[PDB]
Nucleic acid binder design. Structure first.
Ligand SMILES: [Cl-]
Ligand code: NA
Ligand code: NA
Ligand code: NA
Ligand code: NA
Lengths: 460, 216
DNA sequence: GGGGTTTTGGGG
DNA sequence: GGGTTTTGAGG
DNA sequence: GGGGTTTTGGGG
């Protein structure tokens, strides 16, 4: 196989050509009719990546690749921009001014995906190691072969890809629309925003909280199975989105079956600048707390920085598999999300009891200091997406006698029967926690069959 | 101001404990909607979303009477006008019914609809499943949250708090996590079902039967 | 044999 | 090809 | 023509 560069490919030969390129954009593999699937992507290389810079505005130049197949599984799923793709037997032709490569995978064409970063998106999600730096993480047909002479091409293209993404935006301003101008678009458009929050709406749907450089905040629904790489604090490019005119309560973006959410390789200059430039926004949350019914979810808590990298475990696994799963049994500290349905005891004033560290007994402070050290003994009855339909409510404890979750309410324990200020703060918190669309992101430590909240504090 | 007639209607129906007599009267007017599909699923749109209309055995017979030269299962891309319709909540298996969510469904009961044959409608955005809409899904989640929270505050009582001595000095203490599982209501099965709204009931025809009735 | 493809009947 | 299937909760 | 396959020379 002889590999040609994008800009040097023949437009007249019309013969099958092969090449290596960097994928900067791609749609999701979508079905067009009863027997065809398509995946359109944008590709670049050392000979084609930027338009005549002088009046171009540092706009990225590129060729397009359209892969056709009879099956979904025969097309490449591009989760991240910057990776490399190797195509075989592709015919090139001029399409409205630009070099368009076409390949019928259903016939004799083939593709292979190579990771530019150490690991591929899928490998990072599963914390796996790549067989080698010459092994494709995905490819069409049953087999894929990499000749010795290719290694040089692949390695060099990787070195170039990083230099490219760290030196240029790649996804130039002309490749997407500002969220605060999204309502002015006639149809679909592209977005480049930071993921401020990933809310698990239900068993199969994630609701992303986006905010781009324009400062505008938007929400959009992302299926878990389709986009399992979405992560809070990460910058992504959304291919094809539309402004929802029917959403009056909040700004929402609609995605189609061909829409795609794409992340950037580590060396991405754009992704780096945006991760630091775009700062978290809580305006939406604060405003919703003034309404009796908020269609906007509100994460009332924030876990200690040291746990920010800890993976979340659903209530389903926490209460139904924590004693039968090998992996779950090995852990004593977990992170999870849920919404409070009810708080016990009912009387907020009894949230703080007196504790005798010698007899290991607590008691009401309605009689005063004659009970010992003041501590929180709150029993949350929660539920989550994984247990949304069952007839259960799960108990999550906030017993601070040993220091776990002492500063959860941002209010030091105290006789709530005498300290009006302390009581009022806790009462307001009580209403927020039990309010619809309010959720808690917290770290819990399993102790004698129960889960106690720790290193978790309210941010409202 | 909600632009989607369907979204508004279905939303108020839910925010009104499934009581159709409580929903705004200024919304119970004839519904002119575009037919996106007719088989195997009959889906109509209001310009923004699509919903599955449930025709009564009466509605279809009346239709075939006034329009002999018209087959319902062939109204795709055509427009129809529902003069007499009603809404009602129903418990379903969202795993099988894609026009539902959280095992709940708001049905569009059709009693009488005229087929405005060959009427070109204005261009609109691609229609999406209402029960897949972010806001509508959330509205339904609010509905269950209110039902669930009420049921729990009626079922759980006495402040049966875990004895602090259990979570303290747990050096030589082991326990099963399921001990934190509390029943939300007096529901019979393992699925919550303690709702106050009274599940509407009305005989409706399966799109398959109307197919055989027009072509065995 | 049967696809896609153009070889439009025949290689390995 | 900057697009629209059903598998109708990757498509 | 050339794959994968078995048809192992020939259809559409
Ligand atoms: Cl234990
Ligand atoms: Na042929
Ligand atoms: Na042949
Ligand atoms: Na052959
Ligand atoms: Na053969």
């Amino acid at each position: 196989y002889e590999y040609v560069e994008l800009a040097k490919a023949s437009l007249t030969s019309a013969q099958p050509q092969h090449f290596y390129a960097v994928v900067i954009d791609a749609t999701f593999p979508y079905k067009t009719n009863q027997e065809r699937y398509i995946c359109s992507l944008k590709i670049v290389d050392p000979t084609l990546y930027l338009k005549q810079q002088k009046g171009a505005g540092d706009a990225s130049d590129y060729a397009t690749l359209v892969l056709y197949a009879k099956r979904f599984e025969d097309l490449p799923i591009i989760h991240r921009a910057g990776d490399i793709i190797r195509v075989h037997r592709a015919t090139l032709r001029l399409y409205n001014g630009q070099r368009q490569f076409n390949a019928n995978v259903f016939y004799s064409s083939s593709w292979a995906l190579f990771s530019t970063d150490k690991r591929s998106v899928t490998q990072e999600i599963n914390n796996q190691d790549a067989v080698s730096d010459t092994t494709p993480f995905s490819f069409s047909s049953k087999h894929a072969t990499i000749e010795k002479n290719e290694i040089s091409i692949l390695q060099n293209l990787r070195k170039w890809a990083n230099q490219y993404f760290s030196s240029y935006s790649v996804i130039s301003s002309d490749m997407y629309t500002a969220l605060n101008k999204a309502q002015a678009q006639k149809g679909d458009f592209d977005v480049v925003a930071k993921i401020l929050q990933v809310h698990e709406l239900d068993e199969y749907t994630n609701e992303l909280k986006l905010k781009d450089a324009s400062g505008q905040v938007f929400y959009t629904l992302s299926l878990k199975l389709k986009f399992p790489h979405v992560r809070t604090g990460e910058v992504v490019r959304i291919r094809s989105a539309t402004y929802d005119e029917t959403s009056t309560q909040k700004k929402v973006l609609i995605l189609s079956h061909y829409s795609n959410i794409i992340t950037f390789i580590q060396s991405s200059k754009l992704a780096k600048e945006l991760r630091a430039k775009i700062q978290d926004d809580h305006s939406v949350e604060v405003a919703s707390l003034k309404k009796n019914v908020s269609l906007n979810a509100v994460v009332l808590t924030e876990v200690d920085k040291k746990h920010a990298a800890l993976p979340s475990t659903s209530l389903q696994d926490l209460f139904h598999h924590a004693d039968s799963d090998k992996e779950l049994q090995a852990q004593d500290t977990f992170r999870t999300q849920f919404y409070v349905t009810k708080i016990e005891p009912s009387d907020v004033k009894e949230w703080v009891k007196g504790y005798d560290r010698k007899t290991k007994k607590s008691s009401s402070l309605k009689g005063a200091s004659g009970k010992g050290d003041n501590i929180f003994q709150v029993q949350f009855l929660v539920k989550d997406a994984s247990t949304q339909l069952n007839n259960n409510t799960y108990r999550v404890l906030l017993y601070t006698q040993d220091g776990l979750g002492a500063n959860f309410f941002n209010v030091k324990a105290d006789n709530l029967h005498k300290n009006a200020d302390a009581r009022k703060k806790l009462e307001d918190s009580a209403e927020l926690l039990t309010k619809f669309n309010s959720y808690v992101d917290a770290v819990v430590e399993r102790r004698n069959g129960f889960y106690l909240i720790k290193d978790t504090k309210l941010i409202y | 101001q909600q632009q989607s007639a369907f979204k508004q209607l279905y939303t108020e129906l839910f925010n009104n404990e499934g009581d159709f007599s409580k929903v705004s009267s200024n919304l119970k007017k004839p519904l002119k909607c575009y037919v996106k599909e007719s088989y195997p699923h009959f889906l109509v749109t209001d310009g923004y979303f699509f919903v599955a209309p449930y025709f009564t055995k009466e509605a279809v017979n009346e239709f075939h009477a006034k329009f002999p030269n018209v087959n319902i299962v062939d109204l795709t891309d055509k427009v129809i006008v529902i003069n007499n319709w009603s809404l009602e909540l129903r418990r379903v298996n969202s795993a099988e019914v894609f026009t539902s969510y959280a095992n709940l469904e708001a049905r569009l009961i059709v009693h009488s609809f005229k087929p405005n044959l060959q009427e070109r409608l204005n261009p609109t955005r691609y229609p999406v499943n209402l029960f897949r809409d972010d806001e509508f899904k959330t509205t339904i989640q609010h509905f269950r949250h209110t039902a669930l929270q009420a049921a729990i505050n009626k079922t759980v009582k006495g402040d049966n708090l875990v004895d602090i001595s259990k979570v303290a000095d747990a050096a030589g203490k082991k326990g099963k996590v399921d001990a934190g599982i509390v029943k939300a209501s007096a529901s019979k099965g393992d699925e919550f079902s303690d709702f106050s709204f009274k599940e509407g009931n009305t005989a409706t025809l399966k799109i398959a039967d109307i197919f055989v009735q027009e072509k065995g």
